[PDB]
From a paper:
Inherited missense mutations in the myocilin (MYOC) gene, within its olfactomedin (OLF) domain, constitute the strongest genetic link to primary open-angle glaucoma via a toxic gain of function, and thus MYOC is an attractive precision-medicine target. Myocilin has no known function, and there is no glaucoma phenotype in Myoc knockout mice or in individuals with a homozygous N-terminal truncation mutation or hemizygous deletion of MYOC, but rare non-synonymous coding mutations lead to toxic intracellular sequestration of misfolded myocilin. However, not all mutations in MYOC cause glaucoma, and common variants are expected to be neutral polymorphisms. Among the common features associated with pathogenic myocilin misfolding, we demonstrate that a single metric, OLF thermal stability, can robustly segregate benign from early-onset disease variants.
At the outset of our study, five variants could be confidently predicted as benign polymorphisms: T293K, T353I, K398R, A445V and K500R. These mutations are all found on the protein surface and well documented in the literature. Three of these variants harbor conservative substitutions (Lys to Arg, Ala to Val). Modestly lower levels than WT were detected for T293K, E352K, K398R, N420Y and A427T. Structural integrity was further confirmed by high-resolution crystal structures, which were solved for 11 OLF variants.
Residue numbers in the entry: 244 to 502
The structure:
Amino acid sequence: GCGELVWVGEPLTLRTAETITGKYGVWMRDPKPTYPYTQETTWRIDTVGTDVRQVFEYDLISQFMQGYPSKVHILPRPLESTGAVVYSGSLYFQGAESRTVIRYELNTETVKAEKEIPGAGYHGQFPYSWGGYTDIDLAVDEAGLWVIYSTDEARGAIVLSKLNPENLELEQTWETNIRKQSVANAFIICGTLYTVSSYTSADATVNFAYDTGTGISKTLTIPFKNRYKYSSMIDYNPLEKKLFAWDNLNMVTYDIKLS
Ligand SMILES: [Ca+2]
Ligand code: NA
């Protein structure tokens, strides 16, 4: 049930971090859950600091919203920024101070693949507008795994590549005309990249679209509210058909409508 994004709902706060370590972070669910996890399993990473390794795992939504983790994973290498995703049983994350994406299989706590994203800027070269070393943003949509980044050759414009989820090979690449540092974040729905204009405003917008199927770029004016005035992470979950975001300590979700 795909289409163009035409509306974003009000943010709903599901959990609030209680310490500075969670001012920024990433939380997610697996759109292709695999044993022993389910569509309720949630992962949370508080990403302030320089040695981020703890991944909080919750078996049930109730636990994510009110309790302690069911399990804590300690990653073998520190993680960079807020761009990570979970897909088909693995956490895909960027190694700190690198352009390396790592596939970490959660049930075995094993690194199964690593890949430098060719030519990608990293560690503050092509972040989103808030900074935060957000140079490399993973994404899952209806067709699988992607990565959003930029390169010198692209002159800082958003590049996105489809990824093989097993071995992290790049399968196809598209170049937009959207300056990555000029937008607050981005996500992919049904093969179209969308960007958000501001990470602080209550009256931000989803302001650009790039359709990988047609090559066409568009401007948009869909309202987008940053309720807590500092959104560090905005991703799309194609199973729930919702946006998942992190806004100034708060793990929030937005409903959407597609044409
Ligand atoms: Ca994103
Ligand atoms: Na991401």
